[PDB]
């Protein structure tokens, strides 16, 4: 909901966009499914919200086109009917109107004279489409965050929090110019992961033969460290698998703080986790199972 | 600005003219104790007992005798010696006494008779079921708000990244309106976005107050609001053409009725100089008249 | 602090008022509460489109107005000249009695 | 609320602020968890406003 | 449902001929008798879309 008056365009379009790339995107009926149970049957919920980019240089043709002013009143009548549809409906204009008109609206809403075009010729620009952009929310597993002990409650206040992940190198090159010294680490060797923290379902003994497949545990250290030295603690990020430090950036995600957020079940008095329901049903199941147990041996042991 | 210690502090039960406050455990003191004393003896009584341990007399059954008996097979006793219902005896669990269920019942009256606590719908929700939570629903309640906490704290992080990862022409897609442009320095403040899950009691609900503004609002401001707000209602309602077909909706003039409207006009002018003619008319007749009295005096 | 309950009940209030001072007051207070009831049900558009909103006034039905004021002056002077036509004939018919006297 | 008459846009104003400062950068659910367990458990809440 | 505004015809179009090959090609009573029965008898539902 906006909260001011001017807000309502804008939070249309928010919620618009993140209900589609809640639904589109995620699975809500698993997600949902693997957060209340995540909640109730450990007692925290550390879900870390990401981004996934997979940015591809592709290089296309696009034509050029050679302006010349309109002087016929039925080119100034195409050009406003093209403006008309690029404001009322956007995907109509896109699958509708010609190239040489959209080039002209385009040019138009750059400078502001009305001009038409004519194809010259044709160019061969890059592109750097991102193929995928969707966020990632997963559930994560209390094995692998190592949030600060400091943080008197108040996960805003910790200073550092280690995440551990089973990421392959396709994953690392899905996004270039982002992850450094990727060749001092062994790709090829067909080894199963021997990290002795990291508690996954992967089964001890699988491992991809292949080379961009092959899996390993990649640490990544979301925290606060002061970089230019002055005191004023900057967010940063650092991944490292193994012994070879990969990443090292500020936080690039715009709120500026760690990309986790934990829900207790049944609160602690001002203490960040929470404390799950098998905590006062204990010794409750002991006696109602030694009761049932002294049950069927009465019944076992006898003769019928 | 206020001049005082930043401390806030609230007692629980208060105490009489004193500043700290005592908390709830304070009464209910040797009720846990004695409660607890008591499980404690019962289930002593049940571990320390023998659950299906027969025992046997010595003399009943001979040998191969209790070989077939501890085998399934039938047997056959000797009678001199007793009789296997009431010998061969199988032990079971012992009887609780009475006497521990009724303190542990005395005890826990007294205790919720010292502190009155008996044991035993999310959103902007009508009142109707706002009201009907009994006990435990506001204790599931009080679970289901941390859940929805933590999505909405997702959605927020999720709406705060999509304004800087994707595209203008990814959004003018997903949305086929207008890109609205949201400024980078601000996206650390959530300043005009509102993020919360939505569940059908709240949709219902919003329809409701949709309806209720509609009906309130409906004759004294102008066709557009009250046709914006039915639209939102379709909206909510999962018809996304009914809402285009009522926002860009301009009633046609009437080319008829707009003329009669400025002959009408046009009629009220001439019936006016009509009115003046007459008037006109009727002193040049009063003229006329007194021209005529001075010729005949 | 503030509840579901006492959003609920301050939307009635509200609601009340409305119902109460509808008719007296013009059309400004009203808007303004109705602005207020919509901002309770979390509808932060309508309240802008409720609060500054003037009411356009109808050239034609402007007009009309005018034209009925004139009508009604026309009317008086039209009543004061046959007032007048009146006295004129009256002082007529006096002479011709003088005259047939 | 305002108390008098002439106070009511500044009690807007107020609540306006207040009411994001405790919904975009205190967690509520958080802190009303532990303001009710921290007051019910050990008898007093003191609390820091800074 | 349509999404937008301007998907209203490709939603209908798609909805009518998705609820065509649902009812005539595909037997909707053993897909969801075997979909059910599959998912509550073995745990998971794994289905194939060719």
């Not at chain 1, 149970?37 to 086109?65: L, M």
């Not at chain 2, 003399?59 to 061969?88: C, H, K, V, W």
Request: hydrophobic share 35%; charged share 30%.
């Amino acid at each position: 909901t906006p909260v001011t008056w001017e807000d309502e365009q804008a939070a249309r379009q928010n919620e618009l966009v993140l209900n589609y790339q809640f639904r589109t995107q995620l699975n809500r009926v698993k997600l949902v499914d693997d957060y209340v149970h995540s909640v109730c049957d450990d007692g925290t919920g550390i879900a870390r919200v990401g981004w996934e980019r997979k940015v591809v240089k592709v290089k296309q043709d696009a034509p050029v086109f050679q302006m010349y002013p309109v002087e016929t009143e039925e080119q100034v009548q195409i050009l406003q009917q093209a403006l008309d549809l690029q404001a009322q409906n956007p995907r109509g204009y896109e699958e509708q109107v010609a190239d040489d008109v959209k080039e002209a609206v385009n040019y138009f809403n750059e400078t502001g004279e009305a001009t038409y075009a004519i194809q010259t010729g044709t160019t061969e620009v890059e592109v750097e489409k991102a193929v995928v952009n969707r966020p990632t929310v997963e559930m994560l597993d209390p094995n692998n965050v190592v949030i600060d002990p400091s943080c008197n409650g108040d996960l805003d206040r910790a200073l550092f929090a280690v995440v551990s992940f089973e990421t392959c190198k396709a994953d690392l090159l899905k996004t270039p110019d982002r992850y450094h010294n990727l060749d001092k680490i062994d790709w090829e060797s067909s080894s199963p992961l021997t990290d002795p923290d990291h508690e996954s379902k992967t089964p001890g003994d699988f491992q991809f033969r292949d080379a961009m497949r092959k899996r390993v545990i990649a640490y990544e250290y979301w925290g606060f460290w002061d970089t230019n030295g002055d005191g004023e603690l900057k967010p940063i990020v650092a991944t490292w698998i193994g012994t070879t430090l990969i990443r090292m950036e500020e936080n690039p995600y715009p709120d500026g703080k760690l990309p986790f957020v934990l829900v207790p079940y049944m609160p602690r008095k001002r203490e960040l986790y929470g404390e799950a329901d098998a905590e006062l049903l204990g010794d409750n199941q002991k006696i109602l199972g030694a009761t049932m147990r002294g049950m069927i041996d009465l019944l076992g042991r006898s003769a019928n | 600005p206020d001049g005082k210690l930043p401390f806030v502090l609230v007692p629980y039960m208060p105490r009489k003219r004193e500043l700290y406050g005592e908390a709830d455990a304070e009464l209910l003191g040797d009720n846990q104790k004695i409660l607890g004393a008591t499980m404690r003896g019962m289930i002593d009584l049940l571990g320390r007992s023998a659950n299906g341990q027969r025992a046997y007399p010595k003399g009943m059954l001979d040998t191969l005798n209790r070989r077939r008996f501890e085998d399934g097979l039938d047997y056959e006793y000797n009678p001199q010696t007793g009789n296997p219902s009431q010998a061969i005896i199988e032990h079971k669990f012992p009887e609780l006494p009475q006497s521990a269920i009724v303190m542990s019942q005395m005890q826990n009256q007294e205790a919720e008779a010292l502190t009155g606590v008996k044991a035993f719908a999310y959103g902007d929700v009508a009142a109707g079921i706002r009201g009907a939570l009994d006990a435990a629903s506001k204790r599931e309640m009080a679970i289901l708000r941390r859940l929805a906490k933590g999505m909405a704290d997702i959605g927020t992080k999720i709406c705060a990244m999509n304004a800087v990862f994707l595209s203008e022409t990814e959004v003018v897609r997903i949305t086929n309106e207008e890109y609205v442009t949201i400024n980078r320095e601000d996206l650390k403040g959530n300043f005009d976005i509102e993020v919360d899950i939505n569940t059908a009691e709240v949709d219902n609900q919003k329809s409701q107050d949709l309806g209720f503004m509609v009906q309130t609002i409906g004759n004294t401001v102008d066709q557009q609001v009250t046709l914006k707000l039915v639209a939102r209602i379709a909206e909510l309602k999962r018809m996304p053409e009914l809402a285009h077909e009522l926002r860009t909706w301009k009633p046609e003039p009437d080319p008829m009725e707009e003329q009669l409207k400025q002959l009408a006009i046009q009629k009220a002018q001439l019936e006016n100089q009509k009115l003046q003619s007459e008037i006109a008319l009727n002193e040049a007749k009063v003229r006329a008249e007194d021209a005529k009295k001075d010729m005949t005096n």
